[PDB]
């Protein structure tokens with residue numbers, strides 16, 4: 001005959017694990033973010049000679065609290081067999097599950113818990129080094145681990161294997177929209193009943209001369225040699241994004257499941273919206289039409305009116321055209337209400353985490369909901385007349401409301417692929 | 427706290443586009459498959475001399491009907507900006523949309539049509555060739571299109587741009603499960619209301635010395651030098667898969683939407699199940715637990731009892747362990763009903779299309795429903811005691827009886843990622 005009705009369950013976020021250029025550990029990173037810190041640094045080394053971009057954002061490595069020590073998460077042997085983004089994902093997943101208090105042991109809990117971690121790009125250096133090894137030293141020098149090491153889905157696979165997660169096992173690779181799709185897809189799977197818990201997020205760790213060359217050739221990266229100033233979303237002098245690396249993982253969980261085990265609940269995922277610009281492979285719709293459609297779709301999924309939104313964590317990566325288009329979309333969707341909400345882009349602090357960007361920013365939007373405090377857009381000391389909203393410039397803002405705090409987070413990628421998540425306080 | 431009831435719509439398949447080693451074009455490819463043909467051939471090229479593998483399945487190229495002519499779909503200029511899998515996906519999507527009669531022109535129809543095309547692995551030679559170019563000829567000799575060519579989501583992106591498809595734009599990358607996830611995710615998006623039409627599928631075209639070396643070092647590939655016999659799913663002498671290339675795209679469409687425009691409908695997508703083995707990085711569970719769980723999840727999603735299944739298109743790639751494990755899962759789940767259904771693997775005809783495998787096999791299962799005719803498992807002239815089911819050996823079987831024709835198609839991937847689709851006649 002026709003469609004029936006089915007139960008659509010409620011989904012909450014009960015844990016967050018962050019491995020980022022601001023540091024390692026969700027709450028330390030939040031403190032640093034709110035305090036106006038940044039992990040953008042100058043490139044070092046002759047190997048970056050000739051490339052127009054001279055800055056990036058690295059995960060700080062070492063044994064100190066807040067630094068990333070791979071050995072805390074994977075063994076020396078495991079290091080050789082997995083890629084850098086996979087290792088970061090395992091770290092972030094470990095931290096997220098510890099943050100959530102969810103460590104499935106029984107077969108039932110194992111099968112009820114899935115993984116949806118995406119990666120935006122293959123580890124290019126693993127491919128090129130192996131090719132050289134193969135071409136010079138022959139077949140027998142190729143590692144039996146080569147293929148599993150290089151596959152985009154192996155962050156999700158290894159997290160599943162290492163933590164015994166037997167539910168849905170999914171991995172998206174949608175360029176800079178990856179981390180948002182991972183969270184949204186996990187939300188849908190839980191709402192649908194495929195799993196009661198999902199370990200969701202994104203990872204990327206591919207800063208190298210070759211990758212920076214590629215993105216510079218696509219004219220995507222900032223050419224500013226000053227790492228303090230390079231990334232400045234909405235700023236008149238913005239000149240391209242700054243490549244970062246890291247992983248962000250969130251534990252999503254069915255609402256009753258969370259309540260019954262007395263989990264700490266940060267926020268509820270209310271809606272997920274998706275669209276395509278269908279315009280250009282790298283340039284965004286200049287009017288921001290795709291961004292408007294995915295934000296609108298997220299609001300429709302959530303059953304929320306534009307007027308009910310308090311905060312938008314913008315994608316705004318510090319590009320001339322990108323930031324302007326998103327700003328346009330926000331103003332066109334929210335009309336007079338655009339002046340009554342707050343928008344900020346946190347990429348000034350983290351850099352652009354590529355496949356992890358949408359997940360890290362879903363984490364920051366979740367924490368903004370939980371704390372009703374908004375992280376700043378760094379470096380925004382002035383703006384053009386077209387940028388006339390509250391972008392939380394420079395300094396964090398309190399945002400207290402007695403009504404429900406509801407936020408959106410946007411992610412857009414090459415290929416014109418767009419997603420928005422609608423996340424709310426409880 | 428437990429959630430709210432929402433409309434869950436019905437979803438049908440109204441077009442199929444195939445670019446495969448059996449040829450190009452829907453009913454042509456089906457005819458060849460049903461006729462017992464195969465596209466597996468000897469590897470040609472001196473670059474393959476050192477590697478143990480000697481067979482593969484290529485898309486036949488040329489201007490004859492049934493051959494792939496890239497110039498029919500993409501300009502000579504656009505070719506340079508796109509990878510081989512992207513080009514095959516464009517061809518497959520155009521053919522699928524032609525087959526469906528869906529060419530959206532209105533703003534409403536364009537926004538209602540999304541794209542979900544995945545890719546398992548980008549061609550490795552694009553990376554290593556660019557690396558060499560960068561090293562020896564410098565930054566300013568790197569193609570500005572390098573990053574687009576190495577992104578998994580570019581097939582979905584290009585299909586969106588080229589056919590102005592403005593709905594959800596999503597690209598999964600779950601190794602050999604990719605094509606199944608793309609169709610299932612599309613099904614869920616349409617059922618949920620995100621889109622009324624999705625152009626869904628998978629593409630891969632990465633046969634190269636390094637890729638084959640990788641799979642050989644992983645002990646995944648048949649070393650049989652006879653292309654007529656190399657791939658033989660369920661056979662006593664099976665010894666690894668044969669790598670293929672290609673793309674398969676299906677137009678999924680909301681049921682009322684299809685009826686209203688008087689679409690020709692092939693089949694209904696009833697359910698989608700996902701699981702993870704959480705075991706070995708490349709091998710499936712020897713007892714097929716994960717496979718059992720994803721099949722069972724698909725039946726649950728579809729609202730269908732095991733006894734209602736009449737046909738399974740097996741993932742069975744022609745590996746000792748994998749084929750036995752899937753067979754075990756089928757027997758464990760269906761119990762005595764396992765002897766009442768039919769199971770076949772079509773990889774003897776196409777080879778293993780990697781990220782496209784689950785989509786091509788979804789297409790074949792869809793056509794099995796439509797025609798009530800089952801494609802054979804090639805080369806199965808005998809079997810071991812444990813393989814005691816009806817595998818449609820050698821010759822196609824008519825399947826016109828019982829009640830509703832309901833099929834399953836299974837796909838399994840490295841990282842233990844599993845998916846099943848349940849697809850039925852109407």
Ligand SMILES: [N+]
Pocket residue numbers: 313314315358361362409410411
């Ligand atoms: N964002």
Ligand SMILES: [N+]
Pocket residue numbers: 739740741784787788835836837
């Ligand atoms: N299959």
